Ligand binder design. Structure first.
Ligand SMILES: CC(C)N1C[C@@H](O)c2ccccc2S1(=O)=O
Length: 284
């Protein structure tokens, strides 16, 4: 069923809450035993958001390999994503260790450091060129190279140095700065413009490790970003673009991380973004 007609049918019937609960009911349940070990309590932002054991990213160290981060591998689309929480004061070094080890080219940030008057993640990148950051626990140096501030988003060029080997890489930081404190954006136009800037950078391409994507918990806004990207890529690849089922794609992605898409409004917004984005994919 053409999703645009499915959309109008759910809207006219006001059944978004019903569709969303059906997804919650059918979603995978896999163990998260490593996340719940007492040694890892200060590595988790939220007690109820944990990576599954089967898909969790492992840090390359014998001491403690744990980070709250999941590998989402989309086999038919040929895209992979790492979805992670906003870094905590004691996990900023782990965060950049993961970027280095997984060979990512991009970091996508969908939250502000402060929202609703509370801290949603650590200030984990440098704000001035001449004040670099050193992460003593993981032996990394991070320098701000340049910053491009736009109306809806900011792009930063960062230099990450492995102080152990003196190798350096360029990391691109894509910061969507206008998601409202409550609800979802009224139009998906600025979110789609942002998604197309990440794509144009090379950050999502198979020559690089997987993009790192985060919000505060790494399931809600973060889920919306990867769901919209994968659905549009499948509509490009297939003979029949109308065969793309957004609900089935979301349940596939929920095999790899719990709770992706946090509200019925986020589900409706994901449909809107894919429907409006397809009017480019199909030749406009
Ligand atoms: C081997 C080539 C294709 N690269 C892939 C990846 O390892 C990476 C990650 C961050 C910055 C640069 C690079 S890369 O251009 O050296």
């Amino acid at each position: 069923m053409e999703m645009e007609k499915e959309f109008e049918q759910i809207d006219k019937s006001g059944s978004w809450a019903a569709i969303y609960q059906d997804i919650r009911h059918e979603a995978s349940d896999f163990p998260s035993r490593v996340a719940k070990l007492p040694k890892n309590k200060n590595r988790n932002r939220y007690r109820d958001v944990s990576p599954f054991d089967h898909s969790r990213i492992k840090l390359h160290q014998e001491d403690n390999d744990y980070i709250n981060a999941s590998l989402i591998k989309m086999e038919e689309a040929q895209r992979s994503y790492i979805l992670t929480q906003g870094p905590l004061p004691n996990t900023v070094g782990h965060f950049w260790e993961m970027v280095w080890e997984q060979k990512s080219r991009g970091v996508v940030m969908l939250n502000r450091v402060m929202e609703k008057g509370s801290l949603k993640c650590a200030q984990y990148w440098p704000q001035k060129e001449e004040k670099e950051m050193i992460f003593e626990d993981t032996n990394l140096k991070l320098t701000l190279i340049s910053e491009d501030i736009k109306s809806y988003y900011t792009v930063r060029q960062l230099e990450l140095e492995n102080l152990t080997t003196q190798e350096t890489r360029e990391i691109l930081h894509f910061h969507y700065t206008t998601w409202p404190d409550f609800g979802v954006p009224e139009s998906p136009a600025s979110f789609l413009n942002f998604l197309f800037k990440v794509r144009e950078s090379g950050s999502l391409s198979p020559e690089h490790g997987p993009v790192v994507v985060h919000c505060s918990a790494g399931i809600g806004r973060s889920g919306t970003f990867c769901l919209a990207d994968t659905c549009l890529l499948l509509m490009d690849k297939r003979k029949d673009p109308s065969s793309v089922d957004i609900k089935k794609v979301l349940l596939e992605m929920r095999k790899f991380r719990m709770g992706l898409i946090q509200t019925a409004d986020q589900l409706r917004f994901s449909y809107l973004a894919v429907i409006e984005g397809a009017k480019f994919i199909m030749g406009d």
